[model samples]
Target: QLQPRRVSFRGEASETLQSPGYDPSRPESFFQQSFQRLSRLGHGSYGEVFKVRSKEDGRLYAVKRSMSPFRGPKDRARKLAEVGSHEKVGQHPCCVRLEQAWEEGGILYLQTELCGPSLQQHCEAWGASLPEAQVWGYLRDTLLALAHLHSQGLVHLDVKPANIFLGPRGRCKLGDFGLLVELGVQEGDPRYMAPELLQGSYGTAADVFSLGLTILEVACNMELPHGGEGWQQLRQGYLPPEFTAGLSSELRSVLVMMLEPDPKLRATAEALLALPVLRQP
Candidate 1:
């Protein structure tokens, strides 16, 4: 088992590290000196990610290098909030751990636990729907993370296959926090957004709804409609008969409660975890 490194840094000094004068290309640069960037992992609106090895500790980590600049105190605070949220649940086995964070040249760098391909990539590689038992395991692990997150009053505005990482031990670990928000926040991936989210209500239930769609995609081998009629129908809980036809009643029923259109009627993460259908036999 890997123990998390304890990071100790002067807050003001770390903030000042974001000074615009740093050069990433220079061999002598702080980033280059601290980490040897091995390869590009991926990229998104948040920024690019790299598989890096730490020169100090010689451990591997995934570093998220932000493309956006940390402008001022407010902007920096906003960015750090993402890091803060990740740390809040870092120790949980179902959640990816964040080891350290810093800003260089105004770009936020988050050092997180290195895991295998995301559930999205895993599904694509398999070239078909996941086994029902596998889907249940994923769902259970994800809900455990969601239950802990919601308990902390945090809402992971984004919860999808791409954000659920498969660890070396085959544990499903929820990661990515570009859209994590506190109570009463807005925004999320449109296809996974709950019906209440469309009206600007943010709650923990939205995560459950997104996870429901993610489960559907993997279990039914679905190509989720980004928008238009199919998207609207999904939000309204109009799952196709074929989608649920292969699912057992217990699994289908839990998904129905999870995708419940009304937030009030939706199954909470805790509630879902409590179900005997979800409990390991």
Candidate 2:
């Protein structure tokens, strides 16, 4: 016959220990009820991401978990909106899908479709430059994604190499929507930010700016000129004289129009698609 033992903490009965549901030997059961973390995928400003295996489907997923303390109102609202946007757009092949979002205790968990290496990592593995044909192919797919997003009245404010993922079967997906916004929402990332965004205005043209910068990055196989004192050089129109000299005339013209400092003079997605370079094999 076994006897129950009373446990007390601070002269008070330990309700947690006394509860019949408590099982000290079954600590792993907690996580057993959920997915298992197989490996860490990466980390971002908001939190770390892990590659997890679903207990139900045996499928793999990328799970993002934030560690910040909850701030109550505006912050929570923003997070909710982000999750909602992911849920709405997740189905697109070019967009990273959100599988699930749940709050346990104070931590927020976001599960997404598992993706492979990022374009930046791919470039690094290739010695920081890709063949011209491969570069053009990537640009074509990225443009397709952007075209789709623009048609939906959404803008992907961040379009750097790190946010573009490369999957099997030559598939490319645009991800990291932490900076995404509605059609006219004003935001900027100076490194890849267009001129208009820096002036406190936002529009689809801002994405065009990023596209132009991406073109330059592909061409030079290096970071753009928006760093440190070099930013002043850009303000003074100090890009290399031959920046577009080697590119095909049509591609060069399209890039020029997209990178124009004046937002009103920038090319639209429709206009860019009309360029002969895009039609070339």
Candidate 3:
């Protein structure tokens, strides 16, 4: 187990090395040397992520720093849980790697692989709709990543274009594990969220549902409708029929199964991988 090297108290520049439980050191404290913040890579509800190069190794990496203090014990625990769980997942070709994590002076930090623009950003740069072959390739890679995570007993509760990174190698990697949860656990995200998720029953099926929405989003260049007149009017069905019209029949069937409001009806990762659309080159 890693332990803190030093501890400080209020109004004290240098305090005596306190007992184990009283240590003030946090994960961010480990990264004492300053690395130039190259640019803002991304931002989330908690804070912004920066791309930086290590002076010691000349290697580029990403640093996610929390901006606000955790709300309380529950919030702090949740943060720790996310970091710890992600650490357990470690590095994977399909998933964004988590190199290290630490906290200092109340600020939490996560150092990880710094990949380039996300799928959403890439789509925006390339004008939304990519060729069908390109779209299928991206979908296949993403499903492979999801399948790997599911095999590890992890459920990436949030799956969206913004969470998918387009690496320099022309491959895609699934990023953003903040909303990841254990398989069979319940979680929710509004736009791509499945009906079961809203009902507090999260699982691999919910992930597939989100992936389906992402495919639609990338193909249509349209944002998923959220609650209000738009969502309220269309909440009763899978997706508006017009959205599926442009998609191949095989792909459309897969989407329908994934977007099923009932979790039991949703396809499994293996089942999805076997779909004609995904099996194609």
Candidate 4:
């Protein structure tokens, strides 16, 4: 039943709603017997991630757990919807894949493919500034990933350094599908959030705005303060000349379009991908 031969979205949502058909070998009671929790990987407002290993397959995994108790029907549905979001995207190269999910110890848990440090963690280690070439590589991969998400009628909702991960050989991918389901999900900080998200309305364009902010930090170690002048300026659709002084106009121009205050004015991921500069890789 673990066959992943077909990488389609078929039966994906169905898996979330009804786990009744789960293999008899791995019944609801069996959820507790399969994975052995190992170590705490990361913690945040939304949830904590734990490193675990499956006894059935003896493979490592990252299990995300919600801090709040999963006792109510609404809470259970929300957690399952988070799993469904992973299913919603199915198997995409730039997106993380969900393996299994269950409620254990009064908490909801999702087991997914594991990856190394987040782009946020890696960038902070390097003084928050990565080489332009490296940022380009990440940007390229992220755009393709975003393109895929948009194509599937899904919005990433949270697109920032912390949500982006690099795998073996520095392959970049987008993670944290939980954000796609959580209603009060706050983007890491207001500075990276798009103006529309501020108004409590958003779509794929909201992600493009955050993408621009993430790239600016990676490209120049630059980020607007949460409530500072730069942050205020960006919210007003203004880009300070200091931030765009060095990069090629082509790349900077695309970034500008990405951060547009009006969601309708913002470039789509597909449109962003067609840019000549990003077309290089």
Alpha carbon lDDT of each predicted model: 0.80, 0.67, 0.71, 0.74
Residue range 115-153, candidate 1, lDDT tens digits: 989999999999988888788889999999999899989
* Worst window of 10 by summed lDDT in candidate 2: 1-10
TM-score of each: 0.86, 0.78, 0.81, 0.80
Give the TM-score (vs. native) of candidate 3.
0.81
Q: What RMSD value applies to candidate 2? A: 9.5
Taking the tens digit of each residue's C-alpha lDDT, what string does model 3 give over 1-281?
A: 23432221122333222322232444333444545567888787878888987655678999888888667777766766667667656667888887656555556677778887888888889985666667777788888888888888888888999889887645788987877777543344678777665567767777887888888788767677877765543334546666556777766666677677677876777888887667846
Clashing pairs in 4: none
Q: Which pairs clash inside model 1? A: none
Q: What is candidate 3's local distance difference test score? A: 0.71
Error of 3 at 176 (Å): 1.1
Q: Is candidate 2 or candidate 3 better by TM-score?
A: 3
Model 4 spans with C-alpha error above 4 angstroms: 1-33, 36-38, 181-189, 198-201, 241-246
Candidate 1 global CA lDDT score: 0.80
Clashing pairs in 3: 26-103, 27-102, 27-103, 28-102, 28-103, 28-104
The lowest-lDDT stretch of 10 consecutive residues in candidate 4 is 1-10
* Candidate 1 residue spans exceeding 4 A from truth: 1-27, 71-75, 184-186
